[PDB]
Amino acid sequence: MNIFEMLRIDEGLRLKIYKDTEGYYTIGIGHLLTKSPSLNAAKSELDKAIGRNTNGVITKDEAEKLFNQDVDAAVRGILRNAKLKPVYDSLDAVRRAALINMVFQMGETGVAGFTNSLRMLQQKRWDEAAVNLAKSRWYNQTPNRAKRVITTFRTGTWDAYK
Ligand SMILES: [Cl-]
Ligand SMILES: [Cl-]
């Protein structure tokens, strides 16, 4: 298991524009296109992202490309963030993947705001962090996914994904 496979599981793969768990226009492997209610707008962002007139649909390869770029940007964002990087460098490889997943889903800004969980993770207080992480909107809105990420932080193994 790796970051790519883990997110491909959490996110799924869809070749036509769809709305995510929050009602926003997305395509591929959880690639958010826009928060705008407009489908034209979503189509417009898509075409710009792909470099062609896609008309709302893309190929598997195009989807994989976006995903690569998105995973890359997520790591980069973590490494460029002063509240995140330290946590991330302090973690083992499995738990780093959990942190990337959250960033991919919620943006760096949003993850940087879990101050207390970030500190517990940094101190290696696994159970405590897992309890604190669940006290969140993220956990109440997408509980299944959140449980898998949380278990990963708690155990440092990929069991939630096996
Ligand atoms: Cl893009
Ligand atoms: Cl979920």
Ligand SMILES: [Xe]
């Ligand atoms: Xe976190």
